[PDB]
A paper describes a structure:
Among these, a very flexible surface loop comprising residues Gly72 to Gly87 is not visible in the electron density of ligand-free LH3 structures. Two tryptophan residues Trp145 and Trp148 proximate to the UDP-binding cavity consistently change their side chain conformations in structures with bound donor substrates. In the absence of donor substrates this residue partially obstructs the cavity, thus acting as a gating residue to host the UDP-glycan. All our LH3 structures systematically showed Fe2+ and 2-OG in the electron density near the core of this domain, confirming that these cofactors are tightly bound to the enzyme and providing a possible explanation for the observed substrate uncoupled LH enzymatic activity. In human LH3, the Fe2+ ion is stabilized by interactions with residue His719 and with residues His667 and Asp669, which constitute part of a HxD motif fully conserved in the Fe2+, 2-OG dioxygenase enzyme family. Residues Tyr656, Cys691 and Arg729 are fully conserved among LH isoforms and delimit the pocket hosting the 2-OG cofactor. In particular, the side chain of free Cys691 contributes to the positioning of the carboxyl moiety of the 2-OG cofactor in the direction of Arg729, forming a salt bridge with the guanidinium group of this residue. Residues 590–610 constitute a flexible loop capping the LH catalytic site.
LH3 is therefore a multifunctional enzyme capable of converting collagen lysines into 1,2-glucosylgalactosyl-5-hydroxylysines through three consecutive reactions: hydroxylation of collagen lysines (LH activity), N-linked conjugation of galactose to hydroxylysines (GT activity), and conjugation of glucose to galactosyl-5-hydroxylysines (GGT activity). Here, we present the crystal structures of multifunctional full-length human LH3 in complex with various cofactors and donor substrates. The LH3 monomer encompasses three domains aligned along one direction.
Author numbering:
A (entry chain A), B (entry chain A): 33 to 71, 87 to 285, 293 to 591, 606 to 738
């Protein structure tokens, strides 16, 4: 048994990049001892280091890269596997032969394993290593592969110093040419990989060639990145703050944007330490931003608008917003947030900063689906592809902070990373690539990790694909594509609490029920949308139907989702599908039709919703039920009334004395 | 001016028939003085009477018949008109020439009036009359017409004694050949006739030839028979009773016959003075008569049945019933009453007897139409024809007792008239004539008047034309043809009082109403009719619909007539047409389906009627309304329940513990 205390890991690193520190923590997990050289040219550095270990027969030494390497096994298993190899210096094997390709005939014939050599990782005796590395006397420009290559192809030297290759990946697993051979193997508190082509559990995982992101994905688990019983290994889980530059971007017509601007005033973070930047490409949103801008500039320390008059493409706008933080030494962090991002959690900026990352993004997914603000993998064309664990991450099966090749719409970048590591302005611009794709590619080409955190519930994304802009109030027609947000602005706040009970629902007259349904904004926007049409009109009324305006299917879904479940709750035994042919708003002013004579309605039950206040917009009677000697004298605006429409409830519309009355009614279940 | 005290009216009468006494009362009305001869042969009697008045130049004498004659004018007008004639002996004129027809050329040419002579009535001086009547020396067999005839055709004798004819009916109106010339002329307290062909108001109306009934019709008004301001002239208007033989006849299947037999026990007349006779030609009614016969024989003094086993035609049965009264000197009156005659008034026998007539009948008409138990006129073939005042009599415009040529189904005959005036047995039988027609013709051929009285409301006739006899209870299917009687037996007695109010209707639970609808007989006959079918059977039940039995249209009319008006009364504002596709009776016994799970009904409102008692037929729960915490614990048999079927009334059929439950239900207004 070789003593672990005589195994040394030697690696090269000119800078402490994020890939190097990841390699170091995988080594400290297995309690390795690592010698880092320099905090073909690295062969010159290894050769110099091996002159101290020229006579060290007692020492095993393994040399690997650091930027694209992670350790998966313990040193004792590593030394044990090296003894079974029966070699004095064991190299790594690969599926390809490079630099020179014609040397493929030189190599010995291997049955099923890999045949060629890879200098990215080898292990052997310090004496045998020294006799090999010290023969190097060449230029720094020439690669390291060709040197160790033909030395192995020397048949006499191959037999004298016992040189062999890890043909079946017992210790070294090179990913290029074997991505389909590598899977992960989980355990209680550690993860590992397995070569299913030879059924081996390698120690060293090296992401050579175009397998960088494949190692970033493996690096999220191996060795203790994420464990099924311990979770993440490096995320947080359980006096002034930094100064941040908040950059809002409105590059497309975004629904509920007034709610976005009002939400910026509620982020739990000292506003005097946040500098707001806002770019608006749409002339549609200039009113909305103008309404909120007085509150914005009085809340934050400094603000700035770049409206549509500058005519800046989204790439040029994102360059300027980030460059204004890089050229400001007081900008410690840069928070870029798009308009189509709703942040339910109001501490994301604090939590994302405390993760102490360079580029971290909060995970946001559209309500109920899989699409999110990140890509688990890429295609050869750098287009989208689904990773093996993409769905487990979106569904929050496995939580933590993950090395992800793509992020968008929301991310926090360290300020010093911008000036020192990505100092150019053409981050988003410069090519025919999408401005959000060139952003992520600009960070990966610098070896910078794009972190995605799903440890908390952060928020959701808005469906802004087909946003019909030809409406006086476009957010009304958004009951289909963004229902969870449509309910927050239009459904009464105490409606959901009314469905569960709590005794807020009232029965003013026998078999008529009174519950809050619509919000004051829903009624005001509905009245305005009706008057904007203008063309007002077997008891007759002065009314306008939702069909001629184009809001029937939208109001029918409000019936299916909100009044149906409310009907079955108040009438135990009745089941409703919310079918209604007659949906219309009625006007009551003393100049035309101030009242409505007694009548029945051709429907099973009716829903009568007020649309304005009592005493502010008009003064007059409500709804009178003759057979019961009971009248709804003081109606409530956002509240609605439910009564059977046939036989039992002969009701009369009492006259309006002054002003104008608006009510919404639907003869449902005819 | 001739003094009325020297005008004498001479007439012939071998017996005081009803036609003679009618002529006498018309004379006493105008205060005439009449000499009746004998209480061609009557010429011998007149000639003998004229020998006392041979030298009486001061006396005017008018000779007319008595049986077919009524007086229409006063003597002063009669004498005044005779003076204007300028004649010493004025005869009556006629359209026909008889006996000998060839003597038509003898008569003087008359322009437009009647040309020939009629010896039925003449007026003149007693001296001129004597010189004419005393020339008669012929046989009693030869008629009186030919004697006075050719004496007028003697041209010299016609000019010597001044003989003329009332050519234009100034005084004498002979009806034969001038029926279209005669109309009535009314006044405040007297009636009169008018010859619209000459515009004269005659004094004497003589019904010669086949115009007997036409005079009976005129005799009902002229002179004071019926006056518009005084009404009838001889009817009643404002201590033992006689003994009567009551004869009931069942010659056809008659509906509601059990109610007829039970009604015979309620006629306000001493039963110990009534002898019941009943003929039943139908085997269908032997059960019904057998059920009531114990009560009949214990009520009346003597009874007798002649069932279908004797096989007697209706003519032979009516002969026997009346002959048994004629051959009984103790039978003072004979009351013949048919089965299809409902007597609402229970004093008709008393009132018809107190009219002191020979043959009087109470007027009965089918409810709402014109057909009655009498004919106002006849046709040449003695078939039916409508009289000028037939509709005024049926509609009770003109009231009183009327000389009518036909009666049926109900009449009271004096006993002495049967033995003395119509003693033969072949009254109804003897010819191919209908037995009811030969009855009336047998009385008119004896100069006996058939009186019809409509001074009171007596009753109605039953529609027994198409009586479907192939039913366990045939009176159920009689809601169409006899609704007024169908309601008396099947509709609850307190239903009509419930519709008007009086606070008998109850509201046991909110918006459910409880009112009496059906009678105990209606439910018992409906349950039996259902079990007689036997074939019992989206909540399911053990039920039988009215359609498969054949009682849907009948139950639909009960809905249209009785539950519709009851719905609109209790729900002000709702209008019902009583449309129902689902009408069925449900069984509830613990052996198959004892209960019914909570459910709604596919209808606007439902009518749930119990069909048996609580505690006598079964013991179990009623109807429970879940949403109201209210249960119909103790239902009432004949009562019904009305509740809305949708949404608001989720109800459950509570289990029946013992016995069998029957309920009638109709899902009306789907
Ligand atoms: C929803 O319900 C809450 C409480 O159930 C309402 O809050 C009350 O509002 C009234 C008038 O606005 C105040 O007088 C009370 O003091 C409030 N109570 C609390 C506990 O805040 C709220 O107003 C309801 N929503 C709407 C739209 O009216
Ligand atoms: C119809 O109503 C009358 C009274 O409104 C009912 O007559 C009463 O009947 C009960 C029980 O049969 C007696 O105890 C009372 O004494 C009766 N009152 C009178 C004034 O007679 C009659 O029963 C109702 N009809 C039916 C079929 O029940
Ligand atoms: C590293 O050392 C710690 C404590 O010194 C020990 O718990 C852990 O198991 C060691 N790891 C290995 C791979 O031996
Ligand atoms: C008959 O006499 C009575 C009273 O004596 C008288 O009222 C009536 O008018 C008289 N009738 C005629 C026709 O003169
Ligand atoms: O005006 C009211 O209060 C009742 C209106 C109504 O019910 C209807 O639209 O028919
Ligand atoms: O049995 C009851 O009381 C209710 C029956 C009913 O309503 C039905 O026929 O559906
Ligand atoms: Fe209404
Ligand atoms: Fe029911």
């Amino acid at each position: 048994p070789v003593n672990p205390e005589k195994l040394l890991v030697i690696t090269v690193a000119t800078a402490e990049t994020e890939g190097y520190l990841r390699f170091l923590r995988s080594a400290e997990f297995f309690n390795y001892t690592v010698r880092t050289l320099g905090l073909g040219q690295k062969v010159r550095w290894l050769k110099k280091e091996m002159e101290k270990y020229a006579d060290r027969e007692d020492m095993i030494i393994m040399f690997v890269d650091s930027y694209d390497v992670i350790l998966a096994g313990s040193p004792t298993e590593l030394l044990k596997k090296f003894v079974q190899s029966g070699s004095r210096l064991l190299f790594s094997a690969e599926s390809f032969c490079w630099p020179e390709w014609g040397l493929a005939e030189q190599y010995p014939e291997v049955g099923t394993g890999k045949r060629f050599l890879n200098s990215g990782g080898f292990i052997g005796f310090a004496t045998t290593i020294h006799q090999i590395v010290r023969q190097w006397k060449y230029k720094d420009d020439d690669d390291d592969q060709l040197f160790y290559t033909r030395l192995y192809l020397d048949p006499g030297l191959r037999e004298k110093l016992s040189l062999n290759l890890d043909h079946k990946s017992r210790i070294f697993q090179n990913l290029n040419g074997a991505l389909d051979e590598v899977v992960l193997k989980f355990d209680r508190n550690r993860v590992r990989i397995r070569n299913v082509a030879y059924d081996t559990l390698p120690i060293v995982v090296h992401g050579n060639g175009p397998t960088k992101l494949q190692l970033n994905y493996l690096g999220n688990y191996v060795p203790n990145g994420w464990t099924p019983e311990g979770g993440c290994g490096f995320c947080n889980q359980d006096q002034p703050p930094p100064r941040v530059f908040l950059a809002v971007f409105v590059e497309q017509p975004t629904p509920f944007l007034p709610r976005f601007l009002q939400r910026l005033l509620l982020l739990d973070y000292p506003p005097d330490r946040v500098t707001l930047f806002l770019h608006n490409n749409e002339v549609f949103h200039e009113p909305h931003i103008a309404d909120s801008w007085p509150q914005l500039q009085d809340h934050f320390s400094a603000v700035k608008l770049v409206g549509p008059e500058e005519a800046l493409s989204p790439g040029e706008a994102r360059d300027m917003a980030m460059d204004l933080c890089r050229q400001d030494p007081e900008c410690e962090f840069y928070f870029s947030l798009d308009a189509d991002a709703v942040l339910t959690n109001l501490q994301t900026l604090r939590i994302l900063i405390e993760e102490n990352r360079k580029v971290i993004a909060p995970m946001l997914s559209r309500h109920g689906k899989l699409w999110s603000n990140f890509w688990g993998a890429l295609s050869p064309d750098e287009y989208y592809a689904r990773s093996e664990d993409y769905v487990e991450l979106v569904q929050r099966k496995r939580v933590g902070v993950w090395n992800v090749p793509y992020i968008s719409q929301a991310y926090v970048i360290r300020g010093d990373t911008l000036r020192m590591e990505l100092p150019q302005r053409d981050v988003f611009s410069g090519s025919d690539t999408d401005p959000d794709m060139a952003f992520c590619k600009s960070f990966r080409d610098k070896g910078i990790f794009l972190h995605l955190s799903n440890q908390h519930e952060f928020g959701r994304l808005l469906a802004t694909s087909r946003y019909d802009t030809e409406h006086l109030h476009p957010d009304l027609w958004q009951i289909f594509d963004n229902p969870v947000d449509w309910k927050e602005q239009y459904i009464h706040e105490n409606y959901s609490r009314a469905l569960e009970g709590e005794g807020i629902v009232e029965q003013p007259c026998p078999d008529v029920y009174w519950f809050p349904l619509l919000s004051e904004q829903m009624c005001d926007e509905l009245v305005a949308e009706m008057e904007h049409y203008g063309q007002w009109s077997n008891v007759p009324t002065v009314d306008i139907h939702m069909k001629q305006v184009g809001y029937e299917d939208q109001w029918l879904q409000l019936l299916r989702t909100y009044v149906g479940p409310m009907t079955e709750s108040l009438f135990p035994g009745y089941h409703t599908k919310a079918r209604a042919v007659m949906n219309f708003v009625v006007r009551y002013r003393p100049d035309e039709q101030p009242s409505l004579r007694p009548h029945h309605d051709s429907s099973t039950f009716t829903l009568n919703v007020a649309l304005n206040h009592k005493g502010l917009d008009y003064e007059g009677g409500g709804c009178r039920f003759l057979r019961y000697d009971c009248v709804i004298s003081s109606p409530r605006k956002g509240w609605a009334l439910l009564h059977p429409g046939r036989l039992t409830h002969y009701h009369e519309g009492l006259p309006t004395t002054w002003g104008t009355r608006y009510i919404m009614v639907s003869f449902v279940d005819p």
